[PDB]
Amino acid sequence: LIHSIRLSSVGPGKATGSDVVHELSGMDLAMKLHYLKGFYIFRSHAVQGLSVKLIKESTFYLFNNYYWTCARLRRSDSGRPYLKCNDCGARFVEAQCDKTVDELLEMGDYSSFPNLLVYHQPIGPDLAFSPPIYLQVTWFKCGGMSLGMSWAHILGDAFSACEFINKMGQVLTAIKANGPPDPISIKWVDPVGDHWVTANNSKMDTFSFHLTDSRISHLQSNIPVFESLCAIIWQCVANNVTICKKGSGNLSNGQIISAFQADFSVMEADLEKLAKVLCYDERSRIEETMEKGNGVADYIVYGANLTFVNWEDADVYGLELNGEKADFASFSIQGVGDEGAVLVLPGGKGRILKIILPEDQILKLKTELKMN
């Protein structure tokens, strides 16, 4: 499917100076085992006039503002990791696809897109030589182009990654036009050393589906859209529950994390019960927990307690090449604990729900939704 893969490096066009570092906060360290995969697919009309040279130049000018995303991980004497800004760069991948964009979008099974259009390698087992950003550009027969990013969650959250990609697009356009410029939401896991990967007892699988405005309104028979959908999926999955929404340019993990522990029967509960539960910030607790460990202990956020993620506010379609939005853009989490996760993404009139569980639970959920 994908052939002619070429690797190289990009990075800041301006040296940042020696001795520059970048501290990782408690939230950054609590997300060190998670990654973001985001891919955009454009047709030949939008990518007209673009070549790998232009994209590389735009990335070189983009990383001047995000030089720390090209840094490498070191460990202090106390063992707390940090980013040393040596301008090592981000990994750049060029790929070819024998299919066309029209053919690729006419498959229905988009579940393989994150694995083929995005190049991902975990940080480690040697921290000092693991880039936190992988960018892949794939060229199709019809002339369309795919842009995939693997983004280490230490750098920031999904909104930060979307801002980064939008800035890349803006810089490309500018170059073309004007010339060069105790908490519950986290779970302690067995130490992973320098290999930052989420360990899973079972084989996790992802299943995604789109819901329209009519479906959401009908399900809402009992702001409220996200809560109601979370309640529906929570009831079908059926104690600990985690929610993860947007907070209130700069790259940061500015995401509101909350958790609730329910000593009641979720299995047999009214929908309004779970809705009131969900709609009625744990940054401080996580910060203190990670500070008391000097950043050496390892925790996972996603998949800790059936995480719910609200990316309907994410600018997943903010990348405009030649003033045209991507034909199809999507985002997902790489690395999710056993409890799995649910992701809400901004579709059209409705929302796109991605659900990550063990395969047997995936089949059970598909059976449960076969009539609901």
Binding site: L7, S9, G13, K53, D87, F129
Partner: protein, 427 residues
């Protein structure tokens, strides 16, 4: 021996009814050769190669040869290179794949950029170029690089074109000497000298430690120089060529083989360096200095030397030591007792642009010019060395005080570049 060469040349140099005495002199005097101007190529920031990226790519390429990676790390830690040195695009891929298309692209980019800058600076018309000399050591396509320039700029059919290849990093002064002679022969003519080293074919794809140092040190760069003997250029010329001294230690077997292109055990071509490269380099530099001493030293120093049978800081205001290695600059500074400010241009050029084979002398000249330190009448000594162990030297005299400009390779970094270069760069 070399003192004898210097004095033999000086015998035929100090030499240079009314009508006869005037004519026997005016018709035997050498023509003045003038460096009208020159343009140095400024590699784009998209080609920069920081230390960490180089070492990561080495770790990924030589994955089965840890000792080679360790050797490259040791070499590049003490090289004195900075974070802004550049390599051509083909070498940025994790496995580099050097093709002749990429080599031609890099050659066109560097040479045409330098030539465009030169023609814009001097107002020179291509139809007024009478001589063209291009020197690049390794890259040599069947239609010459000089033929490529002639095609690009539509030079005259009777252009005297020359392509010097395989002559190492000292071949820039060989081109200068050739232009000097050709301007002696041909009155009222212009010569253009292009000095460059295309890195894409120069890159070594094996893992032998003797062949990996050029990968660590050689970086992108190029220069185009306009020389003339026209009387009109005499006023606006930047420099007047005073001397060129050539030394060839190729007769000695050890010097001949100290830098040798050859295949390794796996059949990949690269430049092997001998263990006694430093001894050969010291001997060649000493021979060149001894030969040139009689031509530039004050008569006082020469008489002092003869009596006890000197100080070159008194013979020159500016020094341009080829940036072929930190150790060579160290040793020249130690032996000649040069001050930190007298080797500043060479060290800064090595830090900023790395080892650009035959064009580094012109980056050093640009560095001196952009600090506003080149005054009318100053004397500049350029010295270069390279394979065959040729060692060449040139003496220039500033013809007019040089005002700083903005179309130079140092324009965007000169305000800070007298920087501290640590002995060891920690990764």
């Amino acid at each position: 021996k070399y003192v004898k060469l210097g004095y033999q040349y000086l015998v035929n140099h100090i030499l240079y009814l009314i009508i006869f005495i005037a004519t026997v002199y005016f018709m035997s005097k050498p023509r003045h050769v003038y460096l009208v101007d020159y343009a140095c190529y400024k590699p784009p920031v998209t080609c920069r190669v920081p230390f960490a990226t180089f070492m990561e790519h080495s770790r990924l390429i030589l994955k089965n040869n840890p000792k080679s990676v360790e050797f490259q790390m040791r070499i590049l830690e003490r090289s004195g290179l900075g974070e802004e040195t550049c390599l051509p695009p083909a070498i940025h891929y994790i496995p580099p794949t050097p093709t002749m298309e990429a080599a031609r692209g890099e050659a066109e980019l560097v040479i045409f950029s330098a030539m465009d800058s030169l023609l814009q600076k001097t107002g020179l018309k291509p139809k007024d170029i009478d001589i063209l000399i291009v020197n690049c050591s390794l890259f040599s396509p069947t239609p010459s690089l000089s033929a490529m320039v002639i095609n690009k700029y539509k030079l005259r059919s009777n252009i005297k074109s020359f392509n010097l290849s395989g002559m190492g990093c000292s071949a820039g002064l060989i081109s200068i000497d050739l232009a000097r002679d050709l301007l002696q022969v041909h009155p009222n003519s212009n010569a253009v000298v292009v000095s460059t080293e295309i890195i894409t074919p120069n890159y070594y794809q094996g893992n032998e430690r003797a062949m990996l140092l050029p990968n660590c040190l050689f970086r992108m760069g190029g220069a185009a120089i306009l020389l003339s003997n026209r009387r009109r250029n005499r006023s606006r010329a930047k420099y007047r060529l005073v001397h060129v001294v050539r030394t060839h230690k190729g007769a000695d077997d050890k010097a001949y083989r100290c830098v040798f292109e050859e295949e390794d055990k796996e059949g990949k071509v690269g430049i092997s360096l001998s263990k006694d490269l430093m001894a050969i380099a010291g001997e060649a530099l000493k021979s060149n200095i001894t030969t040139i001493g009689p031509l530039v030293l004050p008569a006082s120093e020469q008489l002092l030397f003869l009596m006890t049978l000197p100080d070159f800081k008194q013979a020159f205001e500016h020094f341009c030591i080829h940036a072929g290695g930190r150790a060579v600059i160290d040793e020249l500074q130690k032996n000649l007792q040069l001050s930190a400010e007298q080797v500043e241009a060479s060290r800064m050029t090595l830090h900023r642009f790395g080892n650009t084979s035959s064009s580094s002398l012109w980056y050093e000249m640009s560095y001196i010019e952009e600090k506003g330190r080149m005054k009318k009448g100053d004397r500049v000594w350029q010295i270069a060395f390279g394979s065959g162990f040729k060692c060449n030297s040139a003496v220039w005299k500033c013809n007019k005080t040089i005002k700083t400009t903005t179309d130079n390779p140092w324009s965007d970094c000169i305000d800070r570049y007298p920087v501290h270069i640590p002995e060891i760069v920690k990764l």
